[PDB]
Structure 1
Amino acid sequence: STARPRIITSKAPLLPQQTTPEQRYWRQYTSAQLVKEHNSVTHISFNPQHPHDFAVTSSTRVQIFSSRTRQVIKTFSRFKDVVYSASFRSDGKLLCAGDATGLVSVYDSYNPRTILLSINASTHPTHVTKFHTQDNKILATASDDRVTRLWDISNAYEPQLELTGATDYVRTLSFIPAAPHLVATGSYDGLIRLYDTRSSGSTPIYSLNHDQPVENVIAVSPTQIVSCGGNNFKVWDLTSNKKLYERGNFNKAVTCLDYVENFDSPMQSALIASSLDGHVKVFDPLDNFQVKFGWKFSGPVLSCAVSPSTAQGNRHLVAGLSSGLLAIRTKKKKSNNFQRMMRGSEYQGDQEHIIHNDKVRSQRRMRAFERNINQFKWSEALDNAFVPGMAKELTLTVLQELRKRGKVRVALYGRDESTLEPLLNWCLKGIEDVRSASIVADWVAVVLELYGNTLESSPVLQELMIDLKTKVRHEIHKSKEAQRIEGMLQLLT
């Protein structure tokens, strides 16, 4: 003997733009929440170590949000002017906020009360303030003073190493993963500089020509840099000192840039960017930086951040908008006498000679139509296929299977008028498509072959035939125009 073959569904030849697995994951990202802040939102940082928290800047406001309940857990509001950047340390404990009066304030997360250290930088506003990645006692901050100073937070009176040689409005910088001494710095005249700190540091080691004003710089790899500026974005090799790709798939100036790697995904590395139109678009660096997904937020979108690589909770994607709007989008996530009496269940056979297994892998439930076609009740199978709220593919596979077995007229013999009407209703609907049009051609051909006399006798089916005639004529018109357009293409070859 053998087993019963389950009925195969009807998979038509695939139409273009099917749903890709990257689209599956980035559409699982759902459950939008909108939070109206006071003013614009500049920068959004995630805690690295236990990634369960993320800071968001505002006007004179830093807010620590939580990944578990998406509510604001803490507020740093001891600022006297507009705060620019709130970035956590690479170690978790201590976050730094660069203000616009000209000073940075570095104090521990989960304690707004204790200002731990206040570094007075240049009197121009300091936009970007980062901590180092490899080392954890060296902070680096830029300003509108067009210099980036490397402070050592033990000796917070003097910049341990100043860094000049730029031209205008340094606003982005990035350390590089493998080299713990090499700092890339994105200015505002383009011209991404690369400094080596164990050298003099007054001059860059070498420059890179991103001809538009670069808006952000991220070391995506130990050997690669990604540059966000102007309309396009451009990814550079480091050692060979050459651009590698240039993706100009945006409309206005791209603004923010984020990169995540080796996480629970069909896509290994995700490079996402945010571009002042609501458009946040997500690329992958393995298929040469092609777009895989994109959301649209209404206002001009400033900052974006995807949850870090070791989140292990519900992952988040945060986008902050110049209308004052934070948008969070989150992928979610008896007695002892009796047991002593019967304590042999969980054993699983660890120390025995011969282990035998026989029990069956239980199949999924058969639907009612499949039970009826397996038990040869053809008319009940047809009615149970034409119960109302089923799937189009399922009603198609019932009719396909029943026609393939041959029980068309056998299924249609005993039908009275009120039972013809459900078949004719779905027939009247499914005349519009293509595959359903072929199968409805077969089945209404045999219905008109059978029931002409009761068609004359009862008036309801007469009106149904009127609707069917109108819709089939309309479909002939559609296919005539389509054949004409195909002829036009064959001319235009």
Structure 2
Amino acid sequence: STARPRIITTTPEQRYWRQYTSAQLVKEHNSVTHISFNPQHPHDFAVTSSTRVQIFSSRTRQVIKTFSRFKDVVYSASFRSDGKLLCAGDATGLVSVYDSYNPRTILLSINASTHPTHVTKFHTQDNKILATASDDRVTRLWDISNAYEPQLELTGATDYVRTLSFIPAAPHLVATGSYDGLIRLYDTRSSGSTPIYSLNHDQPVENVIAVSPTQIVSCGGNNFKVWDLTSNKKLYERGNFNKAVTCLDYVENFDSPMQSALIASSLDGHVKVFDPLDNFQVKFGWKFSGPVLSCAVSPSTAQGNRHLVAGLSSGLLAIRTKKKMRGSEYQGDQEHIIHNDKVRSQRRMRAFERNINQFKWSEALDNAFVPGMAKELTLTVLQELRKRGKVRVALYGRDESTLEPLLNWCLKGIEDVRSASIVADWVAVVLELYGNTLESSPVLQELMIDLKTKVRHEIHKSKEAQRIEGMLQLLT
């Protein structure tokens, strides 16, 4: 004996990203300018909005901490590599360092400049040093120990510097991009204050991100370009966006089928995922109410539900999350011969499968035409009965009352190309089997008269369709 065969009824990269189904929309007083994730568990992420910075719990997904000390606009919430310290910038130019989860106590307060300090980031390799970029166009490098004078003051930018980046594996290298359209690389080991070299983006630079030790992606204007420092030239460029790209984030070695993901904001309501392994090609995207100013994803070591967070100029924050008898237990560990025969039961089978297995041909047809049942699954069971050679059998004991459900589907199924040849099959048999009842039943006739009109309509589109096919051949 054999088991009963069971009846038979997009990309791997996409199906990972559609799992971020849960979507909750939060409103903030001002535009959320910057979004940051903690490198450490529970990976709570910070949003910079209005004159405050808010911390959201990953699991709970609501505010746990609020930093309201800042009198003016707040321009940054990047964490330290250990996540203990929070640095931020203000329009007054003051940069303030806070213990994460301790909004009361200010550790270090530094006045970078009189002009706004739009960017403040901790150095990833060297914990002590903190970098600040201001509208003064000098990106001062501060240290926690010395709060009175910068260790290095990188200069040479003739427009606002609103982008700074630290290259992994290169603690000495510092990358800055100004609204000149120039991305400048600096070596802190040397004297500094003069770039090693400048990369021309030709459009104002909104965010510069070092994807890998040698590859840096710069998103500015309507396109983002990936530059290799060893060659010093752009390896790839993509300009699919309509509005000017603003923010861009990168995550690597996460459990998706894709090893690494690159998310880039558009300012068109679009944030799209790009795969570095295939020359940064588009694999998935979202659309939101308004322009996107910030985008971030949970770090690789999220250790729980993965989070996608996007920032809008409206102050709206959108979060998408991918959620992640005392001898009965003996198990015979000390036992001599272990044996097992328990067999799992077959997966719960539908009503129509039961009828065909039990040889209820007519009922299976009745199951086919029931409310709220999938069109594809309808084609399968009918396809089975045709394969069963039970076509006249399933249609023998029927009248106009129980024949109409089949014909109504046929009225719709004839449109579909898949069910056309199958709807073709059933219709002829019932006519050949119920010609006399058709004469004496009016409703079947009016039910019929529409079928002739629709099939005639199907004739026409075929007639054009082959006309379109023929002219296409002339074209080629």
- Is the structural similarity TM-score above 0.5? yes
Please state how far the C-alpha of 1:104 moved relative to its aligned partner.
0.3
Please state how far the C-alpha of 1:414 moved relative to its aligned partner.
1.1
Please state how far the C-alpha of 1:154 moved relative to its aligned partner.
1.2
Is contact 2:208–2:219 with CA below 8 Å preserved after alignment? yes
1:280-314: CA deviation from partner (whole Å, max 9, x where unpaired): 11111112111111111222221111122122233
1:105-159: CA deviation from partner (whole Å, max 9, x where unpaired): 1111212211111011122211110001122111011111111111110111111
Please state how far the C-alpha of 1:83 moved relative to its aligned partner.
1.8
**In the comparison of the two structures, how many residue pairs are matched?**
476
Please state how far the C-alpha of 1:51 moved relative to its aligned partner.
4.1
1:2-47: CA deviation from partner (whole Å, max 9, x where unpaired): 22222222xxxxxxxxx22333232222333222222222111111
Larger displacement relative to structure 2 (225-234 or 67-76): 67-76
| Partner Cα separation in structure 2 for residue 472 and residue 341 of structure 1 | 50
Please state how far the C-alpha of 1:242 moved relative to its aligned partner.
2.0
Please state how far the C-alpha of 1:205 moved relative to its aligned partner.
2.1
Is contact 2:133–2:162 with CA below 8 Å preserved after alignment? yes
| Partner Cα separation in structure 1 for residue 77 and residue 6 of structure 2 | 59
| Partner Cα separation in structure 2 for residue 286 and residue 343 of structure 1 | 56
Mark the runs of 5 or more structure 2 residues left unpaired by the alignment: none
Is contact 1:261–1:270 with CA below 8 Å preserved after alignment? yes
Larger displacement relative to structure 2 (226-235 or 387-396): 387-396
Alignment match, 1:93: 84
Larger displacement relative to structure 2 (172-181 or 313-322): 313-322
Please state how far the C-alpha of 1:361 moved relative to its aligned partner.
3.7
1:343-391: CA deviation from partner (whole Å, max 9, x where unpaired): 3333334344443333324321222222221222211221122222222
Matched, 1:348 2:331: yes
| Partner Cα separation in structure 2 for residue 349 and residue 242 of structure 1 | 66
| Partner Cα separation in structure 1 for residue 55 and residue 324 of structure 2 | 54
- Structure 1 residues 445 and 170, CA, compared in 2 at 3 Å: closer, same or farther? same
Please, what is the CA RMSD of the aligned residues? 3.5
Is contact 1:51–1:307 with CA below 8 Å preserved after alignment? no
Larger displacement relative to structure 2 (444-453 or 186-195): 186-195
SS at match of 1:482: helix
- Structure 1 residues 65 and 340, CA, compared in 2 at 3 Å: closer, same or farther? closer
Q: How does 1:103-182 map to 2 (within 5 A)?
A: 103-182=94-173
TM-score in terms of structure 2 length: 0.95
Larger displacement relative to structure 2 (351-360 or 314-323): 351-360
Percent identity for Structure 1 against Structure 2: 99
SS at match of 1:28: coil
| Partner Cα separation in structure 2 for residue 344 and residue 432 of structure 1 | 63
| Partner Cα separation in structure 2 for residue 80 and residue 428 of structure 1 | 68
Larger displacement relative to structure 2 (151-160 or 440-449): 151-160
| Partner Cα separation in structure 2 for residue 341 and residue 375 of structure 1 | 41
Larger displacement relative to structure 2 (346-355 or 241-250): 346-355
Please state how far the C-alpha of 1:202 moved relative to its aligned partner.
2.1
Please state how far the C-alpha of 1:328 moved relative to its aligned partner.
2.2
Please state how far the C-alpha of 1:219 moved relative to its aligned partner.
0.9
SS at match of 1:355: coil
1:168-213: CA deviation from partner (whole Å, max 9, x where unpaired): 2111011111122211111221221122211111222232222222
- Structure 1 residues 348 and 61, CA, compared in 2 at 3 Å: closer, same or farther? same
Please state how far the C-alpha of 1:341 moved relative to its aligned partner.
38
TM-score in terms of structure 1 length: 0.92
SS at match of 1:87: coil
Please state how far the C-alpha of 1:75 moved relative to its aligned partner.
1.7
1:57-93: CA deviation from partner (whole Å, max 9, x where unpaired): 1222222222222222222111222221121111111
Alignment match, 2:461: 478
Is contact 1:277–1:298 with CA below 8 Å preserved after alignment? no
Is contact 1:37–1:58 with CA below 8 Å preserved after alignment? yes
Alignment match, 2:226: 235
| Partner Cα separation in structure 1 for residue 416 and residue 279 of structure 2 | 38
| Partner Cα separation in structure 2 for residue 304 and residue 390 of structure 1 | 40
Please state how far the C-alpha of 1:405 moved relative to its aligned partner.
1.9
Alignment match, 2:450: 467
- Structure 1 residues 51 and 186, CA, compared in 2 at 3 Å: closer, same or farther? farther
Q: How does 1:13-32 map to 2 (within 5 A)?
A: 19-32=10-23
| Partner Cα separation in structure 2 for residue 121 and residue 93 of structure 1 | 22
SS at match of 2:261: strand
Please state how far the C-alpha of 1:239 moved relative to its aligned partner.
1.6
Please state how far the C-alpha of 1:340 moved relative to its aligned partner.
39
Is contact 1:119–1:157 with CA below 8 Å preserved after alignment? yes
Is contact 1:22–1:292 with CA below 8 Å preserved after alignment? yes
Is contact 1:257–1:274 with CA below 8 Å preserved after alignment? yes
Is contact 2:96–2:109 with CA below 8 Å preserved after alignment? yes
Larger displacement relative to structure 2 (312-321 or 149-158): 312-321
- Structure 1 residues 340 and 120, CA, compared in 2 at 3 Å: closer, same or farther? closer
| Partner Cα separation in structure 2 for residue 267 and residue 124 of structure 1 | 42
SS at match of 1:178: coil
Larger displacement relative to structure 2 (445-454 or 405-414): 405-414
1:431-478: CA deviation from partner (whole Å, max 9, x where unpaired): 110111110101001000010101011111111101211111111112
Is contact 2:272–2:285 with CA below 8 Å preserved after alignment? yes
1:392-450: CA deviation from partner (whole Å, max 9, x where unpaired): 12111111111112111111111122111111121112111011111010100100001
Is contact 2:305–2:323 with CA below 8 Å preserved after alignment? no
Is contact 1:176–1:183 with CA below 8 Å preserved after alignment? yes
1:220-252: CA deviation from partner (whole Å, max 9, x where unpaired): 111210101011110011222221100011112
| Partner Cα separation in structure 2 for residue 381 and residue 85 of structure 1 | 64
Mark the runs of 5 or more structure 1 residues left unpaired by the alignment: 10-18, 331-338
